[PDB]
A = this chain, B = another copy of it.
């Protein structure tokens, strides 16, 4: 289930973080415009860029703490306040986060593994709502 999935991804974090983030950027090529130095590059080229590995893992390290602090896939208000107040997220709307979660859940459905992709969808929806309450447009 959901609590297991957190452990599964933590167990091979850099592989999953890069694979899911590439899934997102290939499914929504427009989203790359927030990520300047990723335009123009094949997946193998991004995987050899230092910043891409480093940053994507830090995104997923935090997503996993937010997921791990949640009760029934409902995140903490203070975690959503964090996400809205980060300077790197100040250009964003909840729609960007909705698209990330759609790529994430699609990735889990197509994969080998037995993820609880229905919970990840619910977590995504609860998170978008919590971002709305903390102020993000």
Contact = CB atoms under 8 A, between A and B. Distances in A.
Copies in the complex: 2
Contact of A122 (B72, B122, B126): B72
Contacts of A131: none
Interface string A69-85: 00111100100000000
Contacts of A129: 71
A129 B72 CA distance: 12
Interface centre among A72, A77, A126, A129, by most chain B C-beta atoms within 10 angstroms, is A72
Interface residues of A, number: 8
Contacts of A71: 74, 126, 129
Nearest to A133: B71
Contacts of A77: 77
Contacts of A72: 72-74, 122, 126
A126 B73 CA distance: 12
Interface in A88-137: 122, 126, 129
10 contacts: A71-B74, A71-B126, A71-B129, A72-B72, A72-B73, A72-B74, A72-B122, A72-B126, A74-B74, A77-B77
Given A71-B74, A72-B126, 8 more contacts: A71-B126, A71-B129, A72-B72, A72-B73, A72-B74, A72-B122, A74-B74, A77-B77
